Amino acid sequence: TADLEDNWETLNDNLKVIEKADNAAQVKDALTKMRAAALDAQKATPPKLEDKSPDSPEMKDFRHGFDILVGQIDDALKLANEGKVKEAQAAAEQLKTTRNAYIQKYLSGQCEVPLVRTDNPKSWYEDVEGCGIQCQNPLFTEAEHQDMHSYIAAFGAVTGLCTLFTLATFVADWRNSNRYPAVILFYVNACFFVGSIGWLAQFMDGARREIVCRADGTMRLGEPTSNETLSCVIIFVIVYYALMAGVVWFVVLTYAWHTSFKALGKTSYFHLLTWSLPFVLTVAILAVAQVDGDSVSGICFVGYKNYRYRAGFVLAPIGLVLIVGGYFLIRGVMTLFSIKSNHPGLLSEKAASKINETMLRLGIFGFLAFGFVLITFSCHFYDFFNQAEWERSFRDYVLCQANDCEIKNRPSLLVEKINLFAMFGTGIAMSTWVWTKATLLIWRRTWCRL
Amino acid sequence: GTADLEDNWETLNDNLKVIEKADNAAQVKDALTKMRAAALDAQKATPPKLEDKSPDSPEMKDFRHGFDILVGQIDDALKLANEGKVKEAQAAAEQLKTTRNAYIQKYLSGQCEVPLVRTDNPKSWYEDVEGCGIQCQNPLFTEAEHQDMHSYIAAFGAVTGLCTLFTLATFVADWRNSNRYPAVILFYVNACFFVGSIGWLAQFMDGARREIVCRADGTMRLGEPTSNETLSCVIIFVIVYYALMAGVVWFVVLTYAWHTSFKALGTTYQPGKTSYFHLLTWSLPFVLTVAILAVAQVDGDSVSGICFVGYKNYRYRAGFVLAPIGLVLIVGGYFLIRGVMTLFSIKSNHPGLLSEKAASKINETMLRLGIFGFLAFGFVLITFSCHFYDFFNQAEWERSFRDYVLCQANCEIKNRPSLLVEKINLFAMFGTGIAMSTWVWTKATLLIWRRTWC
Numbered sequence: 001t002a003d004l005e006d007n008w009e010t011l012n013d014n015l016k017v018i019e020k021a022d023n024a025a026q027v028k029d030a031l032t033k034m035r036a037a038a039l040d041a042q043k044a045t046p047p048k049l050e051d052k053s054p055d056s057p058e059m060k061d062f063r064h065g066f067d068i069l070v071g072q073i074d075d076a077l078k079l080a081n082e083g084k085v086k087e088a089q090a091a092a093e094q095l096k097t098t099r100n101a102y103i104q105k106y107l108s109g110q111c112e113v114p115l116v117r118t119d120n121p122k123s124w125y126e127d128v129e130g131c132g133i134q135c136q137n138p139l140f141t142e143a144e145h146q147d148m149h150s151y152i153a154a155f156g157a158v159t160g161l162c163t164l165f166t167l168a169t170f171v172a173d174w175r176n177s178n179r180y181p182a183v184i185l186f187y188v189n190a191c192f193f194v195g196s197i198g199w200l201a202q203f204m205d206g207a208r209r210e211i212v213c214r215a216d217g218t219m220r221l222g223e224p225t226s227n228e229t230l231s232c233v234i235i236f237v238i239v240y241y242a243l244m245a246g247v248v249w250f251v252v253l254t255y256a257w258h259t260s261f262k263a264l265g266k267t268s269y270f271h272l273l274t275w276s277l278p279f280v281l282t283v284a285i286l287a288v289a290q291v292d293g294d295s296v297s298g299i300c301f302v303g304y305k306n307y308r309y310r311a312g313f314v315l316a317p318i319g320l321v322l323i324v325g326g327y328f329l330i331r332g333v334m335t336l337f338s339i340k341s342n343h344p345g346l347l348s349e350k351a352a353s354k355i356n357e358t359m360l361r362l363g364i365f366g367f368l369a370f371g372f373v374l375i376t377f378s379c380h381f382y383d384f385f386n387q388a389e390w391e392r393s394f395r396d397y398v399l400c401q402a403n404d405c406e407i408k409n410r411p412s413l414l415v416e417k418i419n420l421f422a423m424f425g426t427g428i429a430m431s432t433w434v435w436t437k438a439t440l441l442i443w444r445r446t447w448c449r450l
Numbered sequence: 451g452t453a454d455l456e457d458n459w460e461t462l463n464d465n466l467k468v469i470e471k472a473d474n475a476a477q478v479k480d481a482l483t484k485m486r487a488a489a490l491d492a493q494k495a496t497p498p499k500l501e502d503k504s505p506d507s508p509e510m511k512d513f514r515h516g517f518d519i520l521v522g523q524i525d526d527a528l529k530l531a532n533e534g535k536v537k538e539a540q541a542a543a544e545q546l547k548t549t550r551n552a553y554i555q556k557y558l559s560g561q562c563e564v565p566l567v568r569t570d571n572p573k574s575w576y577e578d579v580e581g582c583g584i585q586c587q588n589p590l591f592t593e594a595e596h597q598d599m600h601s602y603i604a605a606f607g608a609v610t611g612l613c614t615l616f617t618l619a620t621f622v623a624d625w626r627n628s629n630r631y632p633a634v635i636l637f638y639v640n641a642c643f644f645v646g647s648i649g650w651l652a653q654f655m656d657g658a659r660r661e662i663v664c665r666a667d668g669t670m671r672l673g674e675p676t677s678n679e680t681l682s683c684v685i686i687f688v689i690v691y692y693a694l695m696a697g698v699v700w701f702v703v704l705t706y707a708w709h710t711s712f713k714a715l716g717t718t719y720q721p722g723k724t725s726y727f728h729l730l731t732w733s734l735p736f737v738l739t740v741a742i743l744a745v746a747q748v749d750g751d752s753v754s755g756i757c758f759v760g761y762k763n764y765r766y767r768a769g770f771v772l773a774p775i776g777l778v779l780i781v782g783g784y785f786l787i788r789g790v791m792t793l794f795s796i797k798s799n800h801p802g803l804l805s806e807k808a809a810s811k812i813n814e815t816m817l818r819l820g821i822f823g824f825l826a827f828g829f830v831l832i833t834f835s836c837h838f839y840d841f842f843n844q845a846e847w848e849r850s851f852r853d854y855v856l857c858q859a860n861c862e863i864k865n866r867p868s869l870l871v872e873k874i875n876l877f878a879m880f881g882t883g884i885a886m887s888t889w890v891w892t893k894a895t896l897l898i899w900r901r902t903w904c
């Protein structure tokens with residue numbers, strides 16, 4: 001009925017009355033007028049969002065900020081009706097916080113897209129006071145975000161269910177399956193399963209915004225931070241630790257294949273050699289606070305803002321597992337070449353058929369993992385080689401939108417999809433370790449246990 | 451001086467401008483000659499900033515010394531100009547711009563005020579103070595405090611180098627019999643402390659400290675690997691950081707060997723032996739070192755005389771030094787406690803086995819491996835406590851450093867790092883090297899060297 005600008009001024013005016021009021025009747029009346037102006041403001045469409053759908057995320061977030069505000073006005077009203085003026089004034093002072101962190105960005109004029117109005121100085125973009133970078137990655141369209149989300153949902157669900165089956169198959173036969181070198185594939189699978197949970201957490205109701213955005217709607221950058229939720233650092237820890245634990249268990253896989261010949265139980269502190277390196281690296285990223293959120297990937301990761309951190313903590317360790325894993329695979333084929341030439345009557349003897357089965361299967365999984373890890377490496381390499389320029393194009397676009405503006409260059413979502421194909425694909429390929437006639441018997445034995 | 455200091459300074463600049471722009475090889479030799487004279491008259495002068503100062507004061511002595519290195523570099527450039535090497539004479543003349551700006555300009559009327567120094571390298575400019583960079587010598591510590599630290603590092607580093615080199619030599623002299631677990635773990639620990647000692651001692655070579663810790667423009671090394679700077683800083687960092695990180699991981703292996711060697715006597719557990727934990731021990735420090743180089747957080751420090759991680763930004767020291775050492779204390783500590791539990795269990799379940807009557811060689815090796823492992827834990831813990839003090843206080847020190855530096859542009863130092871905490875760190879760090887090197891101080895070593903003495 002009334003204009004949004006007037007409704008906003010009614011909120012300002014009545015807030016002044018509450019703080020300089022001596023009685024709860026003046027507070028009650030000011031809050032009642034605020035509740036009316038908040039609800040009517042909720043019905044209005046911000047001037048910036050006239051081209052936007054009423055069911056669009058910007059409009060839904062706009063309306064949500066007033067839902068929080070109306071609840072807080074109602075909380076202040078039960079206090080005022082209790083004759084608690086001091087407490088009602090205190091609750092009313094919290095309306096300023098909500099108005100400024102959630103709604104203000106839709107009533108500004110001070111900031112221009114992709115910048116967003118926020119009173120939080122820790123959220124401000126470089127030297128621009130009062131404005132922070134919007135949570136939604138400004139270099140990619142809503143259509144490119146949604147296409148990417150459907151892509152992660154699909155690949156993430158498939159990897160999650162495949163790896164979960166392999167884990168369930170292993171624990172069902174844990175007495176007979178927890179034996180080296182077979183149990184290496186159990187931990188490889190656990191790594192990609194936990195990793196998938198990390199990638200899939202964004203698909204829960206309102207989870208992507210909780211993970212990737214700051215409470216004031218700006219993008220999560222340089223986490224761990226003060227007065228922000230733990231959702232970002234949790235997703236990063238799940239994704240990054242599982243990713244790094246996965247490439248380390250891959251080296252163990254190549255090592256097991258390289259030593260499967262010298263040999264033809266063994267469950268000791270092997271875990272110390274595998275879980276330590278991703279722990280130290282994860283802890284190092286948390287101490288240097290280079291954890292950032294991203295709306296298109298829907299996760300929190302390292303080196304999204306500053307590419308060097310992705311190069312140091314993702315590219316370089318994966319490059320080292322490739323050269324170490326590659327070494328054990330080459331040495332493994334040389335030993336296979338040696339045993340085939342020097343002793344032709346080893347693979348030509350049926351006496352050790354169980355040795356021939358496990359060694360051939362180990363090598364297949366070892367080389368398959370290597371190929372996918374090499375694709376994963378190449379995509380992080382393209383990103384390392386080009387993100388300095390992309391960061392400059394990001395900053396240049398964001399800045400002339402304040403003072404037509406073009407995006408010179410941007411990250412490639414295709415390269416990201418290839419990386420995810422190879423990353424989730426390792427998880428799906430490694431899960432086929434349990435896709436044998438022997439596991440059909442394990443689930444039959446599990447069914448006959450009731 | 452016959453001519454004014456500001457007059458001779460203008461002559462020094464004008465000739466330096468007609469060197470890179472000079473169209474004659476004779477003009478290069480002519481401009482270098484006129485500058486040599488202009489510097490010697492400027493050296494005679496007393497800057498108004500130091501007119502209250504005695505002529506034998508540290509300040510006046512450093513002002514004159516600046517003109518000695520300036521004249522000395524002209525001699526290096528005049529011999530190249532006389533040999534017709536125009537490209538080499540102009541390249542050596544750019545090192546004169548550094549000597550003028552970084553060592554002498556602070557005593558004259560100029561753009562910058564100590565601890566800031568004139569630099570034509572924009573990468574060195576401190577914040578919004580255009581044309582000025584932070585001087586290489588740490589402004590928080592005096593020359594005497596620096597000299598006292600350098601003597602301390604020299605004594606501890608030379609002793610740690612010689613002790614570890616003796617232990618490495620003894621192991622390689624009897625390699626067929628010495629290359630055995632858990633004994634050979636002490637050879638790899640010693641190898642880390644030896645290599646690390648070379649890193650710390652590199653600064654004592656002639657003019658090496660300045661090359662390690664300073665930029666070509668005379669400002670301190672920060673955020674290394676830095677473009678168009680020498681690799682001397684990152685080489686020293688890699689040697690010190692990698693050796694430090696490998697050493698504390700080889701310490702975890704030591705505690706592991708102690709626990710599992712006892713476990714192997716009492717239950718189904720393989721000792722130790724043909725196990726390549728080498729993969730973790732060399733990889734974990736490699737992966738950490740490459741991450742630091744990729745995020746370019748290596749910095750130089752004149753008081754330590756090395757390049758290290760997180761000097762400028764304490765969070766990098768916390769993530770790459772404090773957190774890893776803390777992790778080695780919980781894992782190493784865990785294996786030591788488990789090791790004593792197993793030790794008591796063997797003594798209980800196998801009466802008299804670990805004695806001079808029964809398994810005397812196992813008893814003896816397990817006894818000194820435990821004393822070395824508990825001693826090393828104590829030193830690593832002292833090391834951790836010192837890196838923890840630094841982590842807990844550097845956000846303040848960084849703020850005090852910035853506030854002091856900017857105040858001199860447009861005060862007093864509120865707080866600063868503790869050099870005592872650093873000496874205690876170096877005592878326990880080098881002390882581990884010296885303590886772990888005594889593994890070879892037995893009668894059997896005398897026998898090894900007598901048989902090696904042909």
Ligand SMILES: CN(C(=O)c1ccc(F)cc1C(F)(F)F)C1CCN(c2nnc(-c3ccnn3C)c3ccccc23)CC1
Pocket residue numbers: 137139148294296297301303304305387390391392394410411412413416417419420423
């Ligand atoms: C960083 N990025 C920006 O846009 C951006 C944001 C802020 C900033 F200040 C400056 C910039 C920049 F422009 F870069 F300069 C992008 C974010 C999206 N994008 C992705 N990257 N990686 C992954 C991935 C694959 C495997 N594991 N992971 C984590 C990934 C996975 C799915 C979808 C997209 C992915 C490429 C890099």
Ligand SMILES: CN(C(=O)c1ccc(F)cc1C(F)(F)F)C1CCN(c2nnc(-c3ccnn3C)c3ccccc23)CC1
Pocket residue numbers: 588590599751753754758760761762844846847848849851866867868872875876879
């Ligand atoms: C960082 N430091 C500064 O002064 C400085 C410089 C620039 C800057 F922008 C801000 C600052 C400030 F904010 F002040 F911190 C100091 C450097 C000296 N100092 C040392 N620290 N550590 C070690 C050590 C022990 C074992 N291994 N190692 C590497 C060490 C060893 C010998 C002598 C000194 C050592 C304490 C910290």
Ligand SMILES: CCCCCCCC/C=C\CCCCCCCC(=O)O
Pocket residue numbers: 323324327726728729
């Ligand atoms: C573009 C070419 C660069 C990539 C090739 C890297 C070459 C590295 C050379 C040899 C690999 C050595 C790796 C060490 C494996 C030792 C493992 C062990 O046996 O314990």
Ligand SMILES: CCCCCCCC/C=C\CCCCCCCC(=O)O
Pocket residue numbers: 648649651652654655656657658659661662682685686
């Ligand atoms: C006491 C033995 C020290 C040996 C140190 C040498 C090994 C370290 C390797 C490279 C360090 C590079 C620093 C050399 C400085 C160059 C000296 C100069 O020309 O000014």
